[PDB]
Amino acid sequence: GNAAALDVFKFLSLQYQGKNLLNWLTEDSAEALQALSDNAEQAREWRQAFIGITTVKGAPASHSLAKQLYFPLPGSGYHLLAPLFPTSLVHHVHALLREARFGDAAKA
RNA sequence: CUAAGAAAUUCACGGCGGGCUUGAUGUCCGCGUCUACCUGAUUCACUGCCGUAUAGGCAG
């Protein structure tokens, strides 16, 4: 999304009590939905806004510039199989490679 | 029915200034290489004659 809009993500990435405020907003809790408000229904619509950062917006779509690749089924069929780029897996493998190449226990 | 399908890197250029690598040196003792064979498979497609012949035949 927008790079100037990442203040919401820096606000959601806080580890205030023992966990993220995101997962505190997923489950029903008394400390949740009451700290950030003085009205009830306003806190409900703020929850339904703030929990929507993990929900896909819009109809499912893969662009013409995106990749989608037929896969033959065992009987006579095909599935379209549009693959996406795993940025979390690339970030995990990239962190593993930087830790194995540049880490303190590797430099030792 | 292929991480499918698509694509102009390109223009120009002074690397050269200079130089002592030197001395010195024990390679060295010793040694069983034997054994046994078909080059011959048509392996020399030859030399010459009659004929105008390259076509064809003939002699040794």
d(CA A78, CA A97): 37
Span CA (A12) to C1' (B53), Å:
113
CA distance readout (Å), A103 to A87, A94, A98 = 22, 13, 7
Expressed in Å, this structure's resolution amounts to: 3.2
Cβ atoms of residues A78 and A71 within 8 Å: yes
Span CA (A56) to C1' (B5), Å:
27
d(CA A70, CA A89): 24
d(CA A48, CA A38): 16
Instruction: Identify nearest nucleotide to residue A66 by CA to C1′ distance.
Output: B3
Instruction: Identify nearest nucleotide to residue A69 by CA to C1′ distance.
Output: B4
Strand, coil or helix: A88:
helix
Span CA (A62) to C1' (B3), Å:
13
What kind of experiment solved this structure?
cryo-EM
CB count in 10 Å sphere of residue A25 = 20
d(CA A76, CA A55): 35
- Which among A53, A55, A56, A51 is positioned nearest to A28, based on CA atoms? A51
